[PDB]
Amino acid sequence: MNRPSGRAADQLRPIRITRHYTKHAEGSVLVEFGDTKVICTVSAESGVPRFLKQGWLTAEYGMLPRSTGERNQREASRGKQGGRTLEIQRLIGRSLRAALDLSKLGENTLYIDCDVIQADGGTRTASITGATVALIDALAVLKKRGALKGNPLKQMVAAVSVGIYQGVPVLDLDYLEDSAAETDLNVVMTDAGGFIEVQGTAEGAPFRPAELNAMLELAQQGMQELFELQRAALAE
Amino acid sequence: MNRPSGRAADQLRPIRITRHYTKHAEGSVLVEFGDTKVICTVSAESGVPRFLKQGWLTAEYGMLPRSTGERNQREASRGKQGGRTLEIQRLIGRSLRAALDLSKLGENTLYIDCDVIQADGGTRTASITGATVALIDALAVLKKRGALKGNPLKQMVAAVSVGIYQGVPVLDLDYLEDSAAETDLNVVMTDAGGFIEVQGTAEGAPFRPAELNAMLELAQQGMQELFELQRAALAE
Amino acid sequence: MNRPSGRAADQLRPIRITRHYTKHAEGSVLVEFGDTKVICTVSAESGVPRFLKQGWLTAEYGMLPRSTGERNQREASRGKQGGRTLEIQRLIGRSLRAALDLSKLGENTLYIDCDVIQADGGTRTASITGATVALIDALAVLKKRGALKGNPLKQMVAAVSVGIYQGVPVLDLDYLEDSAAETDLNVVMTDAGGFIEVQGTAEGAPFRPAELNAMLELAQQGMQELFELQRAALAE
Amino acid sequence: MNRPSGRAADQLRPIRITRHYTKHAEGSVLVEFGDTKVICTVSAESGVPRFLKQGWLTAEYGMLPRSTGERNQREASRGKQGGRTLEIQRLIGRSLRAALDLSKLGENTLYIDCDVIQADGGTRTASITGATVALIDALAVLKKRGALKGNPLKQMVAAVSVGIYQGVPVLDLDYLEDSAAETDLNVVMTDAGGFIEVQGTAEGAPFRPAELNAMLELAQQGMQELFELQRAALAE
Amino acid sequence: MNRPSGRAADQLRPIRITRHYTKHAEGSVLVEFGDTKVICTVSAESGVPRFLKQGWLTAEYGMLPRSTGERNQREASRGKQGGRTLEIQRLIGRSLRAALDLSKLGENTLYIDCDVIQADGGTRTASITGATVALIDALAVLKKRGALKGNPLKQMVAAVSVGIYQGVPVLDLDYLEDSAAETDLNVVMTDAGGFIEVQGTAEGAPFRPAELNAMLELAQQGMQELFELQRAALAE
Amino acid sequence: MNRPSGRAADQLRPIRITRHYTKHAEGSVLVEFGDTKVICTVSAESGVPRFLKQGWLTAEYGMLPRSTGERNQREASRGKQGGRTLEIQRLIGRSLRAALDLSKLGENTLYIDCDVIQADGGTRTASITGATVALIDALAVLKKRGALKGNPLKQMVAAVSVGIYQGVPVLDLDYLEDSAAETDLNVVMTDAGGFIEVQGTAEGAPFRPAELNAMLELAQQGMQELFELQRAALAE
């Protein structure tokens, strides 16, 4: 009935995307979903893992220890990456690989690094959306370097979450809502309107078909504003 | 058009569930989805992690090195659990926690161990379905021991996968189909017909809404046969 | 004076060996020493470690968390293999390497995986005895593939334990006796009647020469029944 | 003779300090030494390690994978912190502990997290200088919370490097100079003008006493501008 | 027929035992079996692990990287202890625990550290023999401190190896012989003449009963000279 | 005013250097700074890391668990090297690399291993000083083997500490003084009189310029006696 941020159940948080955020990566973006801020960089490396087939792209995720309300243990010192981290990491990699025609990438490898400097819900969705813009900038770099084999960009990709808060589907969850909601959904989509990733979990009352479809439709709606924001950013 | 096992697109593999499979655990089940065979045990431990609120249940997943066509590196010797393992593990724990009213469990902790002795697709879905039966047997043990605080069983839980093979939604994927399919879906549901977990990924052509709903409906259909098989098993 | 299982001090537990237990490995056996049940697989891999000399065989050991009376911590999640595991592992590898003329194996590597699904004493001895049968089946596979350089099978190998229970040497210890006994002995032998491995430890009263020789003679006696069981199994 | 940035041998890079940079920590600062940008947060935690004596402060250091010209392996995934990291970490902790009268801190623990978002030389020196400002802000937070036992701030602390470039002592090294110089020096000082930390290494020609003293004097000179910048920042 | 060191098949290497070797431990011994030199220390710590029953003793083993002909990787930097190390470690602990009546030890814990400064065969046997002397010295320390509950020394313990070199049982193997021999035996015994540990492995021709007994008798013979050397050392 | 050992504020502890200490390494030295005793070995290995440029030298540091007053946890079993260890290790490597003209070393790699058998302050300084002598012996070995490309020895290198004890600069700190002193300094120098390494830390009152220079001058003075001791040792 009333979202903490006073936002409308179908309203995205204020979103900002800053390209060329840090100077070393071939692509670097500061993406902001409200108070969730993540630095997304793409590093172009010559060669490929165990292939011979097309190029490759892999991704990692990290969080600064006090990017969260309560300090979270630095994984570097704990000597291990938790399940959440790997989960988010794998999601990012799949999502961005889906936006590419790896064959046209050449025998190069792209390293996507998404690091959360401030968390407030939806870091994975902000990561995906922001990393895609960094990816485009990177491909332009490799193109100018004549390291590509055509334009490997199959299509743009954005992501967003939805959750049942106070019994109502709400779009783009902040930290408070995410903690409260027992049913949520993270979705990754393309321009065409296809789903590349759909993940929904119910901790309390299991969500029924109608709910899922409603959450899916809400996600699809906000998704369009994201593709818009990305194009805007890419237009300088 | 033609499933390798000659199975019908809406037909489950032959399924078997053997209770009291190994003698130490309070609940032990050998669950078989065709050639996928997994040993699911539940270990009842007194006490709880960092609580004071209700009981607790946590789960782990493992695979014998040659449970797979090509030997997979033993995690114990690699000194680390891969992303797949943690992913499957977390899924199992959430799924089985959703079947319980933790408050009625008492201040006890349940350890779910799902180990694959032979893999051929759907180990996570077989795990969930089989572990639930082991769970019931375990609760009976604790009940007789007067360690419970009521009947913590909220509802049965089963799981199953679906994938687009040769362009058609097929139910309960074996290894061949899983490798071939670029779009799949794993689903966890309750008796009532609610969804507790829905995960779909598209590697190639992104799946559109209609596809998803069709896969979801197929999953829901086979799901009923599973709840049936579990009740049968539990009836000795 | 009275063995818990009411077995005679010179009587082996009921033993069963099932070949082709799981379908992927070139050799797979379910070996059962009473309630001790272990899955032993042999995986044939092309190539060799750091050699140029003959083939190679190496072995690993694992236990399902509730294969034991009290749940034992999964090594994969503990991120380390305990001393017991490595000890048993090394023993298995040496034992099975001793049964082979590595030169005739070719430039192939055999991976022996012994995983305990249910423990009740003597898992290492059951492992050795069962893995040998899996080994034979595997060599037949490689032979048909024309990957061998003759018949690398030098001789069969079996293993068994003995322990001083209630002051009397008893053959093939179950869990209860093993815990009670302060003096035990694990032995690995060949058809010819030679010793390839003899390990005895005394926690309480140190065992004197006569005791050792008596335990050794008991071990040697039961050993013959094992070689018999293996040949039977191999005869379909 | 000519510094890459065209800076004068005794001129600091443009320096900026932004307080309240991220919203969760009791103290958060974005410190910038030219292109070197580091996020420094201080997290106030109740209690103390193994004490009974005074409070405590400990520090960690991290670098985003593409904060450097060439992507540096994420320590979280490498499962270990390199020597450089620990070295810098220990330095930070000592430096900031020296600025405090731990007894007046109370039985609280301060966690200093310095994460490099963009590196270009002097990250450790920027870290120290920036973290001190975050520290002040944090102490104000704890004061208002009535968790202190007086004002634990003994004195401000800043740091800076010096190196022999093209045969001349230069102040505050950027990445290029640092790589070129074979002799450098990192120094940590207080307002009073005391040294809390002096570290100099010579890879090529060993530096003689006169050189050291000259580098020390240069460091001391720029140091004053830093204390000035910190006070300015703290004045809103 | 001819031992490299020209030693007689039943002759021990020159043995030396130096007590109070290093000044911190309650017991410290430099034990030398020919060119094999090991520093054995015993550290007395108040309290016990997970007990309430008696005291405790545990042991560790280490080797300097160039204590061996070819540099062996430092385990500290490899981040793991190999199988050999754990094996030897466990052996040492069992052996020295067998020499004690833990109940009379008090609620104290003894840490045995055996570090090889120079290896040339038989480090484990030299370790055991030397650590026992360090143990005695330590117990005297605790006695004077009135931390004991009687005299926990049940009996002295020494160890030695035997191996088939050039077809002949030889006592106390140096590095050359150990590498050459395919059949060896490590034995741990007490004053009374009992066996606490017997381990024999055959890499080539399996050793028959007569061989084993012959090796055992040789081991038992040299063993007496060791108990003699220990008493001598303990007599200042 | 009064050093525990009754030593004069400008007097080194009794120092001894024994070459050819252990028989396997190309260079092996037992270096003793009073009660601080460290075994320093140099291992000559053919080849080089990731080079093509000159040779290479790298170093490791270790401490026996009871080389210290209170037993320190063995890093091998803790599965990690602490900050102190890496710090000391890096220092050693830099120091000894500075004594060499790597180009003349050939395409060989030198492994320096410094292991403390007994600690009482200044292990790092004793390590450096002793390892240099082991280094010389090693180069002679490689020379005779005709594996060098000239004489890679640029100059001798020694190290020593200084600390403010009871308000007075004292040379070569033992354990007691090191613990007491809040301001100390470790220095590494060459024959010529150059500084290759200068590290000073102040825990309490920050040290002022005059203090530093005084500590530096004291260090430089004792340094000369060390170069003398090394030459003496090298003269048989």
User: Nearest-CA distance from C168 to chain B in Å?
Assistant: 28
Kindly state the helix (H) or strand (E) to which residue E164 belongs, with its residue range: strand E157-165
For residue B208, give the nearest of A83, A86, A194 by CB distance.
A194
How far the first Cα of chain A sits from its last, in Å, is: 38
Q: Can you tell me whether residue D5 is helix, strand or coil? A: coil
CB contact under 8 A, E190 and C206: yes
Contacts of C197 in chain E (CB under 8 A): 200-202
Phi, psi of D41 (to 5 degrees): -120, 150
Sequence letter at residue C65: P
| Crossing angle (nearest 10°) for helices C83-97 and E83-97 | 110
Summarize the annotated binding site of F for phosphate as residue ranges.
84, 122-124
Experimental method: X-ray
Quick check: F87 and D89 CB within 8 A? no
CA distance A182 to A173: 12
Nearest CA in chain A to B192: A206
Asked whether the beta carbons of residue E113 and residue F23 sit closer than 8 angstroms, the reply is no
- Report long-range pairs for C183-187 (Cβ below 8 Å, ≥24 apart): C183/C207, C183/C211, C185/C161, C185/C212, C185/C215, C185/C216, C185/C219, C186/C91, C186/C124, C186/C125, C186/C159, C186/C160, C186/C161, C187/C159, C187/C160, C187/C161, C187/C162, C187/C216, C187/C219, C187/C220, C187/C223
Give me F203's structure tokens: 């825990």
Query: Please, which chains are in contact with A (at least 3 CB pairs closer than 8 A)?
Result: B, D
CB F116 within 8 A of CB F56: no
Pair type for strands D108-118 and D56-63: parallel
Reading the block at residue C56, the tokens are 């190679």
DSSP string computed for D105-133? H-SEEEEEEEEEEE-SS-HHHHHHHHHHH
Contact E157, E132 (CB under 8 A): yes
CA–CA dist F39, D174 (Å, integer): 40
CB contacts, 8 Å: E189 with chain C = 206
CB proximity under 8 Å: C 68-97 to E: 80, 83, 86-87, 89-90, 94
CA dist A171 to A185, A220, E233, Å?
10, 10, 81
Q: Is F113 on the interface with E (CB under 8 A)?
A: yes
Nearest to D195 among F192, F194, F202 (CB): F202
User: Is residue F77 within 8 Å of residue F121, measured between CB atoms?
Assistant: no
The CA distance from C173 to F122, in Å, is 55
Token pair for E73: 């990787």
Which residues, including other chains, have CB under 8 Å from residue F159's CB and lie 6 or more apart? Answer: F95, F124, F125, F127, F128, F129, F186, F187, F188, F189, F197, F226
F210 touches chain D (CB under 8 A): no
**D196/F209 touch (CB, cutoff 8 Å), yes or no:** no
- Name the packing angle between helices F209-234 and F123-144 (round to 10°): 40
Vertex B28: Cα angle to B33 and B150 (nearest 5): 115
Q: For residue E195, which residues of chain C lie inside 8 Å, CB to CB?
A: 200, 202, 206-209, 212
The two three-digit tokens of residue E112, written as one number: 């045995």
| CA distance linking residue A85 with residue A60, whole number of Å | 8
**3-state SS record for chain B:** CCCCCCCCCCCCCCEEEEECCCCCCCEEEEEEECCEEEEEEEEEEECCCCCCCCCEEEEEEEECCCCCCCCCCCHHHHCCCCHHHHHHHHHHHHHHHCCECHHHHCCEEEEEEEEEEECCCCHHHHHHHHHHHHHHHHHHHHHHCCCCCCCCECCCEEEEEEEEECCEEEECCCHHHHHHCCEEEEEEEECCCCEEEEEEEECCCCECHHHHHHHHHHHHHHHHHHHHHHHHHHCC
Full strand arrangement of the beta sheet holding C56-63 = C15-19, C27-33, C36-46, C108-118, C56-63
Using alpha carbons only, give the angle E166, E168, E174 rounded to the nearest 5 degrees: 70
Question: How far apart (Å, rounded) are the C-alpha atoms in residues A55 and A96?
Answer: 13
Token pair recorded at residue F227: 């170069």
Q: Vertex F96, ends F92 and F100: CA angle to 5°?
A: 165
Distance CA A157, CA A172 (A): 16
Give the type of residue at A55: G
Question: Measured between CA atoms, how close is A8 to chain B, in angstroms?
Answer: 25
- Which among A189, A194, A202 has the least Cβ separation from residue B195? A202
Supply the DSSP symbol for F136.
H
> Which chains neighbour D (Cβ–Cβ under 8 Å, 3 or more pairs)?
A, F
Quick one: which H or E segment has residue E213?
helix E209-234
CB-based contact F23:F11 (threshold 8 Å): no
From chain B, pick out residues whose CB is under 8 angstroms from the CB of C65: 41, 43, 60, 111, 113, 115
Work out the angle between the directed axes of helices B123-144 and B83-97 (0-180°, nearest 10): 40
Is the CB of E45 inside 8 Å of chain F's CB atoms?
yes
Verify whether the Cβ–Cβ distance E194 to C213 is below 8 Å: no
What residue type is assigned to position D133 of the chain?
Answer: V
Q: Does F5 touch chain E (CB under 8 A)?
A: no
- DSSP-derived secondary structure for F179-201: HH-SEEEEEEEETTS-EEEEEEE
Range 128-157 of E in CB contact (< 8 A) with F: none
Determine the Cα–Cα distance for residues A150 and D33; give it in Å rounded to an integer.
Answer: 40
A200 has a chain B CB within 8 A of its CB: yes
Task: Collapse the DSSP code of A209 into the 3-class scheme (helix H, G, I; strand E, B; otherwise coil) and give the result.
Answer: helix
Torsion of CA B166, B171, B174, B180, to 10 degrees: 20
**How does A30-43 read in b/e, with b if 16+ C-beta sit within 10 Å?**
bbbbbbbbbbbbbb
Alpha-carbon distance of D164 to D203, in angstroms, equals 11
Nearest to D202 among F83, F196, F200 (CB): F196
Which residues, 6+ apart, have CB-to-CB distance to B58 below 8 Å? B93, B109, B110, B111, B112
What are the structure tokens assigned to E107, written together? 């609620």
- Reference F161, options F191, F187, F129, F197; nearest CA is F187
Chain D residues with beta carbon closer than 8 angstroms to that of A80: 76, 79
Tokens of D21: 């940079």
Report residue A151 as tokens.
């334009």
Distance in angstroms (rounded) separating the CA atoms of residues E183 and E163: 6
The helix (run of H) or strand (run of E) holding residue C109 is: strand C108-118
Domains in chain D, start-ordered, CATH in brackets?
14-236 (3.30.230.70)
Size of interface A-D (CB pairs under 8 A): 104
Which one of C22, C68, C81 has the shortest CB-CB distance to B66?
C22
* Residue carrying the six token digits 């920027």: D126
What does R_g of chain A's alpha carbons equal in angstroms?
18
Chain F neighbors of E64, CB-CB under 8 A: 22, 39, 41, 62, 113, 115
A102–chain B Cβ distance below 8 A for any pair: no
Q: How far apart are CA B211 and CA E201, in angstroms?
A: 63
Going by C-alpha positions, the residue among E64, E3, E58 that lies closest to residue E36 is E64
Closest CA to C54 of C9, C94, C110: C110
B166: how many CB neighbours lie within 10 A of its CB? 12
How many CB pairs below 8 A link B and C? 103
The span from the CA of F31 to the CA of F92, in Å, is: 14
- Annotated binding residue B84: yes
Q: How many CB atoms lie within 10 A of CB C35?
A: 18
Q: Do F118 and E22 touch (CB under 8 A)?
A: yes
Q: Which residues of E are annotated as a binding site for phosphate?
A: 84, 122-124
CA distances from A194 to A12, C202, D55, D117 (A): 20, 69, 55, 34
* Residues 6 or more apart in contact with residue D84 via CB below 8 angstroms: none
Tell me the nearest-neighbour CA distance from D23 into chain F, angstroms: 31
Q: What is the distance between the alpha carbons of residues A110 and D165, in angstroms, rounded to a whole number?
A: 35
What separation, in Å, do the N-terminal and C-terminal C-alpha atoms of chain B show? 38
Q: Do B194 and A201 touch (CB under 8 A)?
A: no
The reply to whether D166 touches chain F by the CB within 8 Å rule is: no
**What six digits make up the tokens of B121?**
């697709």
Sequence letter at residue D155: Q
Residues of B in contact with C41 (CB under 8 A): 64-66
F35 contacts in chain E (CB < 8 Å): 23
Chain C: residue nearest E212 by CA?
A: C195
Contact list in D for residue A81 (CB cut-off 8 A) is: 76-77
What secondary structure, in 3-state letters, does B125-149 show?
A: HHHHHHHHHHHHHHHHHHHHCCCCC
How far, CA to CA in Å, does D36 sit from each of D5, D41, D69, D112? 14, 16, 12, 18
CA distance F139 to A94: 54
